[PDB]
Amino acid sequence: ELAILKEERTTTPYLTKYERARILGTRALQISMNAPVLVDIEGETDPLQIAMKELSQRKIPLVIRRYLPDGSYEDWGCDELIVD
């Protein structure tokens, strides 16, 4: 009902800076709470740096839910949003 189908999604296909910041913060917190890491870590130790490395490779297992003003929403995977 409220969910919007993937074919009719009309929001921007890019990761906004607020979404990028929130995704990085959440992923860093989750990694700091011993969540599995989906990318190989060479010598990195900072959770924020690991989160940025995951984001650059489109490996973050999170979904953005963008709320339209009327209450409907669109679910975008972080692996399908374009990041600068």
């Binding site: 339209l68 009327d70 409907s72």
Partner: protein
């Protein structure tokens, strides 16, 4: 003399009324649109030059385009009142004239003022609509001002498409008052939406919408 200036102001008001009727969708002949001042004096002024407001009343019918776009557009009757002050009797007889000749819309232009009692019988003239204008404020056509952009009344289908596109409720659109001068110029009724295409220095052209109250 003062007779000449009175005639000139009356002619300007007549031209403004004709332009307003043309904008609202009715058909006004091109020759009547450019009906000059000397012709006006010839047709209205008497031997002493006094004018008759009763000779200026006219009728108009919607053009096929306006009729197709707006299905609620009927016949329009425009009458100028000789009486400088209008009371309950004059408004009652105007209402009788409208009802007997089943006009959809009637515009009644008075000279000085309208009594509160005459104002109290305007809303009870259903289903016909009676709108009153003063002579003084019709001398200049405000819609020809630089600061006034072009207002276009939206049809019902267009309003529905707008509300569906923005996923809106009617209370969430920007509002325009019913007594707003452009709203009265267009004869806006409560719940109708005007589209305003406006000059913008950041994008060139910007289209805004407002809803009447």
């Amino acid at each position: 003399e003062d007779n000449n200036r009175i005639i000139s102001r009356l002619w300007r008001s007549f031209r403004t009324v004709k332009e307003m009727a043309a904008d609202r969708g009715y058909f006004i002949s091109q020759e009547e649109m450019d009906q000059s001042l000397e012709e006006f004096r010839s047709k209205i002024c008497d031997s002493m030059g006094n004018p008759q407001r009763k000779l200026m009343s006219f009728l108009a019918n919607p053009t096929p385009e306006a009729l197709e776009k707006y299905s609620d557009l009927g016949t329009l009757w425009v009458e100028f009142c000789d009486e400088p002050s209008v009371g309950i009797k004059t408004m009652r007889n105007f209402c009788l004239r409208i009802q007997e000749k089943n006009f959809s819309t009637g515009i009644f232009i008075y000279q000085n003022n309208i009594t509160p009692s005459a104002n109290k019988m305007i809303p009870t003239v259903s289903p016909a609509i009676i709108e009153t204008f003063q002579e003084s404020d019709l001398v200049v056509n405000i819609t020809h001002h630089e600061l006034v952009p072009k207002h276009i009344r939206l049809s019902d289908g267009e309003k529905s498409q707008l509300l569906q596109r923005y996923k809106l409720k009617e209370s969430q659109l920007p509002r325009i008052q019913r007594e707003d001068p452009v709203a009265r110029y267009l004869g806006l009724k409560r719940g109708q939406v005007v589209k305003i295409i406006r000059r913008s220095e950041t994008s060139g052209r910007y289209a805004s919408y407002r809803i009447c109250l």
